[PDB]
Scaffold this motif. Structure first.
Motif, short mmCIF file in Angstrom:
data_model
loop_
_atom_site.label_atom_id
_atom_site.label_comp_id
_atom_site.label_asym_id
_atom_site.label_seq_id
_atom_site.Cartn_x
_atom_site.Cartn_y
_atom_site.Cartn_z
N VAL A 111 2.91 17.64 -9.26
CA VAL A 111 1.60 18.10 -8.80
C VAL A 111 1.76 19.09 -7.65
CG1 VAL A 111 -0.69 17.33 -8.08
CG2 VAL A 111 0.76 15.84 -9.47
N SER A 149 -5.74 13.70 -18.04
CA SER A 149 -4.92 13.53 -16.85
C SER A 149 -5.51 14.34 -15.70
CB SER A 149 -3.47 13.95 -17.12
OG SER A 149 -3.37 15.35 -17.26
N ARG A 150 -5.09 13.99 -14.49
CA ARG A 150 -5.57 14.67 -13.29
C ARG A 150 -5.01 16.09 -13.20
NH1 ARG A 150 -3.43 10.21 -9.30
NH2 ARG A 150 -2.27 12.09 -8.71
N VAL A 151 -3.82 16.31 -13.75
CA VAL A 151 -3.13 17.58 -13.55
C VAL A 151 -3.88 18.73 -14.21
CG1 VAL A 151 -0.90 18.73 -13.69
CG2 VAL A 151 -1.01 16.24 -13.50
N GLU A 152 -4.42 18.49 -15.41
CA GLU A 152 -5.17 19.55 -16.09
C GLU A 152 -6.39 19.96 -15.28
OE1 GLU A 152 -6.17 18.64 -20.10
OE2 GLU A 152 -4.21 19.27 -20.85
N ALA A 194 -6.95 16.86 -6.24
CA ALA A 194 -6.46 18.23 -6.29
C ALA A 194 -5.52 18.55 -5.13
CB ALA A 194 -7.63 19.21 -6.30
N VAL A 249 -5.21 22.00 -12.21
CA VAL A 249 -4.78 23.36 -12.51
C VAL A 249 -5.97 24.23 -12.88
CG1 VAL A 249 -2.49 22.53 -13.17
CG2 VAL A 249 -4.21 22.91 -14.94
N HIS A 254 0.98 27.94 -8.06
CA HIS A 254 -0.28 28.62 -8.36
C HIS A 254 -0.86 29.33 -7.14
CE1 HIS A 254 -1.26 26.28 -12.30
NE2 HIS A 254 0.04 26.48 -12.16
N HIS A 314 -7.60 25.23 -9.69
CA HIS A 314 -6.85 26.26 -8.97
C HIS A 314 -6.80 27.59 -9.72
CE1 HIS A 314 -5.70 23.62 -5.74
NE2 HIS A 314 -5.18 22.74 -6.58
N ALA A 365 3.25 21.16 -17.41
CA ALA A 365 2.33 20.84 -16.33
C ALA A 365 0.89 21.11 -16.72
CB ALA A 365 2.69 21.64 -15.07
N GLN A 366 0.66 21.75 -17.86
CA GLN A 366 -0.67 21.85 -18.45
C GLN A 366 -1.03 20.60 -19.23
OE1 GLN A 366 -1.10 25.66 -20.62
NE2 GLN A 366 -0.31 26.63 -18.75
N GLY A 367 -0.38 19.47 -18.93
CA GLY A 367 -0.73 18.20 -19.54
C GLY A 367 -0.01 17.88 -20.83
N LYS A 370 0.80 -1.21 0.00
CA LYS A 370 0.00 0.00 0.00
C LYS A 370 0.84 1.27 0.00
CE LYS A 370 -4.04 -2.00 2.33
NZ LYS A 370 -4.86 -2.02 3.58
N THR A 371 2.16 1.16 0.16
CA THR A 371 3.00 2.33 0.01
C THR A 371 2.91 2.84 -1.43
OG1 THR A 371 4.91 0.95 -0.48
CG2 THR A 371 4.54 1.56 1.82
N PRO A 372 2.59 4.12 -1.61
CA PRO A 372 2.19 4.60 -2.94
C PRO A 372 3.22 4.38 -4.03
CG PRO A 372 1.65 6.21 -1.25
CD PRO A 372 2.50 5.18 -0.59
N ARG A 419 -9.15 30.59 -8.49
CA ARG A 419 -9.01 30.89 -7.07
C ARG A 419 -10.39 31.03 -6.42
NH1 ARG A 419 -4.74 29.20 -7.08
NH2 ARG A 419 -6.02 27.75 -5.85
N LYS A 441 -3.11 5.50 -4.64
CA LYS A 441 -3.06 4.53 -3.55
C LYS A 441 -3.09 5.22 -2.19
CE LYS A 441 0.35 1.70 -3.76
NZ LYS A 441 1.22 0.53 -4.08
N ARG A 476 -5.75 4.48 0.72
CA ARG A 476 -5.42 4.40 2.14
C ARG A 476 -6.27 5.34 2.97
NH1 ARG A 476 1.20 4.38 2.89
NH2 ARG A 476 1.46 2.11 3.02
N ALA A 529 3.42 22.44 -8.80
CA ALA A 529 2.51 23.28 -9.57
C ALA A 529 1.46 23.91 -8.67
CB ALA A 529 1.84 22.45 -10.68
N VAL A 530 0.91 23.13 -7.73
CA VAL A 530 -0.07 23.68 -6.81
C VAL A 530 0.54 24.81 -5.99
CG1 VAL A 530 -1.52 23.17 -4.82
CG2 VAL A 530 -1.46 21.59 -6.75
#
Lengths: 90, 66, 13, 66
Positions: D54, B52-55, B18, B58, D61, B61, D18-20, A58-60, B64, B24, B28, D57-58
């Motif tokens: 991630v 992807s999650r990153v778009e 975010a 961002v 921003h 965010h 980072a914009q994908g 479970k360690t990422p 604001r 994982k 947890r 970038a956060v």
């Protein structure tokens, strides 16, 4: 008088598991694996041997290859995961 | 489309994503298997039509809003 | 030693 | 500690990254091999003392540093 009696009294009266404490540097793991273990607050063998396989899984950032390396190095030192300890800490 | 269109559950996975936690670590945190996390993320990917999650993070965010 | 301590008994405490 | 010692142009490229933006399109656009692109992103990864984009970038921003 108290001193003298207290002083005479002498005549009248009379005639673990080292391997669990071993530093993580001795484990000789890969740099990434050691860094991840330290990031997961895994700094002692004594706790580590008590932990289970799934918790390591479970360690990422650790993968099956990391588990394979850790199991192989533990076996080469006669150890493995999930050993039960009593009277903690040693 | 809109992040507020998600369910409270999907909002929870979205906010955890975010917040930078990996998948994982999300499993947890919520004490669930990887399969449910995969199900939620794949539905987000399908509904939001994103790669992807990153778009998504961002864009969240950017304004604001918080 | 027993004899001598026995003498000091009156004063010890 | 300070990112501005690097070139602002590569920082703008990195914000686009980072914009994908995937590495293949990065190499196609920047006229270098994919090996050089990976070397560049690897450099940026250690120079910022980060493990993943991630969180960085956060953090960039939220305070709007650049």
């Amino acid at each position: 008088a108290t001193i003298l009696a207290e002083q005479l009294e002498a005549f009248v009266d009379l005639r673990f598991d080292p391997i669990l404490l071993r530093p993580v540097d001795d484990l000789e793991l890969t740099v990434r694996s050691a860094n991840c273990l330290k990031a997961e607050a895994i700094h002692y063998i004594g706790d580590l041997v008590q932990r289970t396989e799934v918790e390591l899984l479970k360690t990422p950032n650790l993968g099956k290859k990391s588990l394979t390396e850790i199991k192989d190095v533990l076996a080469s030192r006669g150890l493995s995961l999930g050993m039960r300890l009593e009277n903690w800490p040693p | 489309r809109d992040v507020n269109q998600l369910t409270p559950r999907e909002r929870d996975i979205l906010k955890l994503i975010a917040q930078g936690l990996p998948n994982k670590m999300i499993a947890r945190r919520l004490d669930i298997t990887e399969s449910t996390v995969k199900v939620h993320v794949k539905h987000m990917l399908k509904k939001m039509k994103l790669k992807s999650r990153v778009e998504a993070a961002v864009w969240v965010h950017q304004e604001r809003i918080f």
